[PDB]
């Protein structure tokens, strides 16, 4: 069984507590959340097609109490429809509570809650940057492998009313038609190069005229003329993405044709940045909601 109300309740019960109180669910409950949510991810299309109104968040990176502050201001599900753009674990202390509360809502409201895959929702990355460590200390190694099998079926991109294109990373030189995105057959591992790798790793750059090499050593960088031609060929108007920490929680690119979202404020304590989320009304009009520390 999955007493999900008891799970979501025991997670939200620490709301307002002193910072630093963990939520240790049972190994078989967390194991059940992965299987029941993986069941959902594979049933839904790999290229999600969503309808507004919808609230879009960026990266979380294990800042669970900061994920809760996002929900009180944005409305706890099912108040507003939600779509996340990956990067839920790592670089933060509470990665397990973060992904569990996100996996919990995805099961409770499977048509009003949505999660995309990020480059940190991959085995070879979260092993190093602190998520697998969080599994080792509080649970066992096999649970982290259960988490990997769940991430290996997350959707990659989401198209909101054929005018907003959402993904964690950015554009891909090998991306010519949406059928290439649907042609990807889950479960999948994120490769080191190619179409699937680029959608989770590429960055925008104002200095590149075309496709340039990325500093991360993975994927490429695209310029303002790449975004404009892409929106033009697929009758799109906006590219929403994350994958890059921004000072104001939001950062525009290519004359507002693209925007970078980062939802984790005070990211891992080495920046003083703020976290923002993008709200979308019925008329595809967008408003930014920002969390700023003082």
């Amino acid at each position: 069984k999955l007493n999900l109300d008891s799970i979501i309740g025991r997670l939200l019960e620490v709301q307002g507590s002193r910072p630093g109180k963990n939520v240790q669910l049972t190994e078989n409950e967390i194991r059940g959340l992965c299987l029941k949510s993986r069941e959902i991810f594979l049933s839904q299309p790999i290229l999600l097609e969503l309808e507004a109104p919808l609230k879009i968040c960026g990266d979380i990176h294990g800042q669970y109490y900061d994920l809760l502050r996002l929900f009180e201001y944005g409305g706890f599900p099912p108040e507003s429809n939600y779509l996340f753009l990956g990067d839920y674990v790592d670089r933060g202390k509470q990665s397990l509570e973060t992904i569990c509360l996100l996996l919990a809502y995805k099961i409770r409201y499977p048509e009003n809650f949505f999660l995309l895959r990020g480059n940190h929702e991959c085995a070879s990355i979260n092993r190093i940057y602190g998520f697998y460590d969080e599994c080792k200390r509080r649970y066992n190694i096999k649970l982290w492998k259960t988490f990997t099998d769940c991430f290996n079926c997350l959707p990659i991109a989401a198209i909101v009313d054929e005018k907003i294109f959402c993904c964690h990373g950015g554009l891909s030189p090998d991306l010519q038609s949406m059928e290439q995105i649907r042609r990807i057959m889950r479960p999948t591992d994120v490769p080191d190069q190619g179409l699937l790798c680029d959608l989770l790793w590429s960055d925008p750059d104002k200095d590149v005229q075309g496709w340039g090499e990325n500093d991360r050593g993975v994927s490429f960088t695209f310029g303002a003329e790449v975004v404009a031609k892409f929106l033009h060929k697929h009758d799109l108007d906006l590219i929403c993405r994350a994958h890059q920490v921004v000072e104001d929680g939001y950062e525009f690119f290519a004359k507002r044709q693209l925007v970078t979202l980062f939802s984790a404020p005070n990211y891992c304590g080495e920046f003083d940045n703020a976290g923002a989320m993008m709200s979308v009304d019925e008329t595809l009009m967008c408003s930014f909601q920002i969390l700023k520390p003082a």
């Binding site: 906006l238 009009m285 967008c286 700023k292 003082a294």
Partner: peptide
């Protein structure tokens, strides 16, 4: 079909600020 718009284009404030500690 509906096209994307922004709050600053229609006069609405684009940014809504919330603070914590």
């Amino acid at each position: 079909t509906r096209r994307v718009s922004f709050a600053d284009s229609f006069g609405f404030n684009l940014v809504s600020v919330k603070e914590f500690d």
